[PDB]
């Protein structure tokens, strides 16, 4: 309700660029939140609508120097495929190689002298005093490769400098330009005084630098493209066309037309042939078949589909042809919001994420400053204290004096110090790891929306389990009926009929369960009238039913918890109070019966706990996370059900009205808490809950409060989600550690600090190391793809042998 927009940005190539984007867009008034993702080439901003419109924000973006636009809905193919830039990097790298090959050849020639040289290594035979032929060929290669290849980098530095920010390639432009100019001036002085010996100059480095930098950019963009495999597949999995037909009377054949997605609308009939795709989600009309959700929910067993079931737009048909009534078309499709969630996931930046953005923003300036300081220190120490340098540079060469070799060494060190920095590595260390973690999670059915839960799941120390829909399957079934009051005027069939018709309006899962049970065990699907209906959350229901004779041919009812009776002046006798205690002791919820103030009997309505709950909870508490069950049912029922799962503390008689006070009660101590809710049923609790994962929200991942979604109703998804977040955040930390230690070792090592020992790297080695690090970080992130979703037996394999027992006595409940 604040006009937030998802914006598409082009030209993003450096992390410092996006840092500039956030910095200034926050600098501009009227913007409260501004985040940009470099990897996905997109930007999302929340802005005040009336004062400023999207035109103004976009225009701010172009005056930055980048081309933006409102993100489209379907078309997002060429933005994420990365094909174009990897192809032009192929082009540039090959254009650099066709000149590096001569550099390779001359380097190998000049390094190793032959055993029996033909003419005593005449390759360096000078022609013009001070200008060796080798130096001249170096000059021509360097000049031509500069002019042609470095055009791209020069233009990038030019456009970057047109504004305040300096991107990554600018420092490479400085490296090459400084090498060029200093080599040129040394050559000019050599040819001016007509020096006998041509000097050694940095014409070797520009083409080697270009070859290795192009190779590194190619490799790292290829790896980045491999990062988006999951999102790319999900995006290019939706069918762009569908078979729409017309039905005469009995779903017969009238006519068929082939239609694209933009034209089809809701309610249309779509035919999918065997082996076909599902282009639109909808309701199954007729035709038994099977479907597979491997690419969507990451499940294994091919899900069966029958007339009246649901479908997913993207599953492959297996048997026969089936007709579907369109219910969600285009953006409505489940895959649409799945991919939307995945792509926005890399928009909610983590604390470490924004720290990395900050550092990378002020990194290239830091690198250039450090390079200049290194140059200054080397030149001054040479010009003043020559004893230290001569301690390891004693070679007396009348051809080249110490005053010149020292300056040359200083320039080499300053070139290699900024040629070894990898701003790209630091910038893309975290975002790519986040992208790969989210992709693997989605491939397993886990939709970890937002990047915040990735790290915020690291610090979780308590998990709040809901009872209905999470611990239980959510399909309660009626066990047995108890009769307490009169029988003559209250025959069993009549009382069940009247109660069922009364609670027909109810939408509580147990209410619908009892409706179906009564209808099936009476055979009378019809029901009477209802008047004066109310539903107090967490207490019960009650209403007035008329037309009782409708089913009797074959009445103010009160149904709810004990609090409803005591509040309504309905005494609960000890005999009945103890009557249901037997049920509650077996972890099965029970509901009493009261009509016109007469407690006729009681009804036992319960659902078996998920068999996997015990293993999942034992693993979760062994992993080092507290577990607590939240429920609104009777305290005895919570006590019994916790036994089947072994929960130390629970919160029973927690009516949905508050349903959150206990969240704060657990939060106030500061320990992080996560809840595993249902979604729409208790969305506010998840919203307040720090890490609220929705369980079983298949085909309805459109949940706002929950920051994590499990497309499949499998409790083990929760433990898998926490464990996957653990490893993904560990990988983010590892990537940051690598991208840092690389820089803090390269800058000294490239600064020649350890040269006295005898380890000094000549310039192009710096570019090689830059490429190596910038690709190694991405490979480390890609390693996350090698994740195997642990299966049932796997968890108890490590948990087997220690299922710590506990009786109801050693179990806690809510206080007050
Ligand atoms: N349809 C109903 N008829 C009679 N009583 C009901 C009905 N629905 C709820 N109640 C009463 O209100 C209480 C609320 O139950 P409920 O809050 O759904 O427990 P839960 O297992 O924690 N499910 P949830 O609210 O999703 O966490 C029930 O225990 C009953 O005592």
mmCIF file of C-alpha atoms in Angstrom, residues 142 146 150 153-154 157 161 167-184 201-210 213 217 364 367-368 371-372 375 408 410-421 423 750 762-768 770:
data_model
loop_
_atom_site.group_PDB
_atom_site.id
_atom_site.type_symbol
_atom_site.label_atom_id
_atom_site.label_comp_id
_atom_site.label_asym_id
_atom_site.label_seq_id
_atom_site.Cartn_x
_atom_site.Cartn_y
_atom_site.Cartn_z
ATOM 1 C CA UNK A 142 51.241 -3.336 -27.240
ATOM 2 C CA UNK A 146 45.739 -1.455 -26.652
ATOM 3 C CA UNK A 150 41.264 -1.915 -24.562
ATOM 4 C CA UNK A 153 37.739 -1.018 -20.916
ATOM 5 C CA UNK A 154 38.582 2.572 -21.864
ATOM 6 C CA UNK A 157 36.223 3.756 -17.425
ATOM 7 C CA UNK A 161 34.154 8.540 -14.536
ATOM 8 C CA UNK A 167 33.891 0.610 -11.422
ATOM 9 C CA UNK A 168 36.188 -2.425 -11.400
ATOM 10 C CA UNK A 169 37.562 -2.079 -14.927
ATOM 11 C CA UNK A 170 38.733 1.488 -14.272
ATOM 12 C CA UNK A 171 41.678 0.267 -12.212
ATOM 13 C CA UNK A 172 42.619 -2.092 -15.048
ATOM 14 C CA UNK A 173 42.485 0.842 -17.462
ATOM 15 C CA UNK A 174 44.824 2.718 -15.124
ATOM 16 C CA UNK A 175 47.127 -0.303 -14.872
ATOM 17 C CA UNK A 176 47.442 -0.659 -18.637
ATOM 18 C CA UNK A 177 47.667 3.083 -19.318
ATOM 19 C CA UNK A 178 50.348 3.669 -16.678
ATOM 20 C CA UNK A 179 52.348 0.713 -17.970
ATOM 21 C CA UNK A 180 51.977 2.041 -21.522
ATOM 22 C CA UNK A 181 53.032 5.605 -20.718
ATOM 23 C CA UNK A 182 55.981 4.674 -18.500
ATOM 24 C CA UNK A 183 57.262 2.125 -21.014
ATOM 25 C CA UNK A 184 56.870 4.753 -23.741
ATOM 26 C CA UNK A 201 60.008 -2.146 -20.174
ATOM 27 C CA UNK A 202 56.391 -3.044 -19.448
ATOM 28 C CA UNK A 203 55.288 -3.816 -22.985
ATOM 29 C CA UNK A 204 55.183 -7.473 -21.931
ATOM 30 C CA UNK A 205 52.344 -6.866 -19.485
ATOM 31 C CA UNK A 206 49.454 -5.193 -21.408
ATOM 32 C CA UNK A 207 48.643 -8.146 -23.691
ATOM 33 C CA UNK A 208 49.181 -10.814 -21.041
ATOM 34 C CA UNK A 209 46.923 -8.759 -18.784
ATOM 35 C CA UNK A 210 44.232 -8.513 -21.444
ATOM 36 C CA UNK A 213 41.491 -10.732 -17.629
ATOM 37 C CA UNK A 217 35.702 -12.645 -17.061
ATOM 38 C CA UNK A 364 38.424 0.315 -5.794
ATOM 39 C CA UNK A 367 42.969 -0.144 -4.106
ATOM 40 C CA UNK A 368 44.104 2.844 -6.169
ATOM 41 C CA UNK A 371 48.789 1.369 -5.166
ATOM 42 C CA UNK A 372 49.845 5.021 -5.211
ATOM 43 C CA UNK A 375 54.636 3.503 -5.532
ATOM 44 C CA UNK A 408 61.203 0.522 -12.802
ATOM 45 C CA UNK A 410 58.551 0.661 -8.097
ATOM 46 C CA UNK A 411 56.347 1.047 -11.169
ATOM 47 C CA UNK A 412 56.142 -2.731 -11.594
ATOM 48 C CA UNK A 413 55.108 -3.124 -7.962
ATOM 49 C CA UNK A 414 52.492 -0.378 -8.236
ATOM 50 C CA UNK A 415 51.083 -1.906 -11.425
ATOM 51 C CA UNK A 416 50.873 -5.412 -9.979
ATOM 52 C CA UNK A 417 49.401 -4.243 -6.661
ATOM 53 C CA UNK A 418 46.279 -2.854 -8.336
ATOM 54 C CA UNK A 419 46.338 -5.524 -11.050
ATOM 55 C CA UNK A 420 46.000 -8.184 -8.338
ATOM 56 C CA UNK A 421 42.937 -6.715 -6.610
ATOM 57 C CA UNK A 423 36.779 -6.195 -6.478
ATOM 58 C CA UNK A 750 52.070 -7.801 -5.062
ATOM 59 C CA UNK A 762 55.626 -9.713 -12.212
ATOM 60 C CA UNK A 763 52.500 -7.829 -13.295
ATOM 61 C CA UNK A 764 50.491 -10.246 -15.441
ATOM 62 C CA UNK A 765 50.737 -12.777 -12.620
ATOM 63 C CA UNK A 766 48.534 -10.318 -10.742
ATOM 64 C CA UNK A 767 45.838 -10.498 -13.411
ATOM 65 C CA UNK A 768 46.137 -14.286 -13.430
ATOM 66 C CA UNK A 770 42.685 -11.966 -9.967
#
